[PDB]
Design a protein around this ligand. Structure first.
Ligand code: CL
Length: 137
C-alpha cells in the first residue's frame, strides 16, 4: 500500500516510485527537470540500486542541501531530516542533540546516513519503500 518497488517492477512503476521519493524527500516542492538526478534515477530503474539507496542519494545531494541546509540553523535542518527521512517529528530534545553533535563531529553526509541507517528506518521502510509521514508510531 505505501509506495514500494516490488520485484519485476515495470518501467512505469520506477518512474512513479521516483516521483514519490522526490515529493517526500524534497518536502513536496516540485523540482525542475534540470534538478533531477537522472543518473541516480536511471540506476534505480535498472535495478542497480534500491529505493533506500536512492533516497539516501537525494538526501545527500546539492539539491537537498541548497533547499534545507545552507539557509537554516542545524536544529531546523534536523527537524526537516526527521520529517523527510523518517516521516515524523523528533520526540524529544535528546534526539535533536544527538544529531546536532553527530553533525558537528562527523559532518552532514554522516548525519544523513544516520536517519536512513537507523533501526527505525529499517523497520518502517527498509530497502524498497518510500518514507511517508507516519501520523502514528
Ligand atoms: Cl545523477
Amino acid at each position: 500500500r505505501p509506495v514500494e518497488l516490488r520485484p519485476d517492477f515495470s518501467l512505469d512503476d520506477a518512474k512513479m516510485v521516483i516521483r514519490a521519493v522526490y515529493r517526500q524527500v524534497l518536502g513536496n516542492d516540485y523540482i525542475m527537470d534540470s534538478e533531477r538526478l537522472k543518473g541516480a534515477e536511471s540506476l534505480l530503474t535498472n535495478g542497480s540500486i534500491s529505493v533506500r539507496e536512492f533516497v539516501r542519494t537525494v538526501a545527500k545531494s546539492e539539491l537537498y542541501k541548497k533547499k534545507f541546509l545552507y539557509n537554516n540553523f542545524q536544529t531546523r535542518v534536523i527537524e526537516l531530516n526527521y520529517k523527510h527521512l523518517l516521516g515524523r517529528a523528533p520526540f524529544s530534545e535528546d534526539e535533536v542533540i544527538f544529531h546536532l553533535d553527530l553533525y558537528e563531529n562527523q559532518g552532514f553526509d554522516a548525519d544523513i546516513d544516520s536517519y536512513i541507517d537507523s533501526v527505525e528506518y529499517q523497520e518502517n521502510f527498509g530497502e524498497n519503500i518510500v518514507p511517508y509521514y507516519r501520523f502514528n508510531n
